[PDB]
Amino acid sequence: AQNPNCNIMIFHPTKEEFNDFDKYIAYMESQGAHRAGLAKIIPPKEWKARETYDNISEILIATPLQQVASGRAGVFTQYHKKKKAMTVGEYRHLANSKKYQTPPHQNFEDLERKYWKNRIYNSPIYGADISGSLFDENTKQWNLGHLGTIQDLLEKECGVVIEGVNTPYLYFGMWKTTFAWHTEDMDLYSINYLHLGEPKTWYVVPPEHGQRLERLARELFPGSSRGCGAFLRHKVALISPTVLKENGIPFNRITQEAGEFMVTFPYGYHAGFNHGFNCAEAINFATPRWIDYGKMASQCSCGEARVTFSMDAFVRILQPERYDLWKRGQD
């Protein structure tokens, strides 16, 4: 079995290997990359996502989210308070202000220590989940707006044609902006490209051990667990590496820098934080190997998780028994 310790693997495809996206994902899996839940892909030196980032400041962040924490430094939830719209140029200036800027630090490890010590005492503002793309239309390789769609994959594998669309999302971050522990909708893959700016630190639990994380989360967030049998779908709970190590939960960590891709694999729980002002683009995707994970994915039916239009068909076809209850949670 390849990668039996479930380490995060880093890949350096050549420009020739960068042509066929599906083939390269299957290659990484042949080497055991999925066992970690997360892999890093460094693009060939010849590749670029676009020519420059000099003209992005007029993108609108219609609903910036202030991420307010509750709990203790290693075990907390966050809720998102909606703020007034602002442009990317306004948000960049805000991120670089004295109130929100990255503190002085020695290295990524020092900054990670400062994040876990101090995150709860601040409320950073995240420009998350903005439909759109920063890939140039002429970029033909690993262009996250030109991937094969999940609907087309389901149709190729299963023969059933379904409604729905699959487009990318932009994330504008600042110091301490946080992504809570989650797997993707329907336990899909994700791919994330860090277009510019400061790094993003990731934590990940191997898919084979995801239920260990879930059991810890039920213990640590007991009211949330009574409310919902899949409350991590709410995407609000944080657990630090120190707490994970104290409870014996297997995980790994890695820092993504600008110009790098990350892939999360089906049922790979992940969480993390941004180091300073940055912009990332991410999208969900599927492969043949996903189908079995989609059929087994948990679902939130309490009403909290509320998701896209396109998840309807995935539930309806892959999980017909759950469909009626889940749809009630959507309505």
Ligand SMILES: O=C(O)CNC(=O)C(=O)O
């Ligand atoms: O970058 C973020 O805030 C969160 N991204 C992801 O969870 C992802 O790409 O799957």
Ligand SMILES: [Mg+2]
């Ligand atoms: Mg602009």
Ligand code: NI
């Ligand atoms: Ni994710």
Ligand SMILES: [Zn+2]
């Ligand atoms: Zn729920």
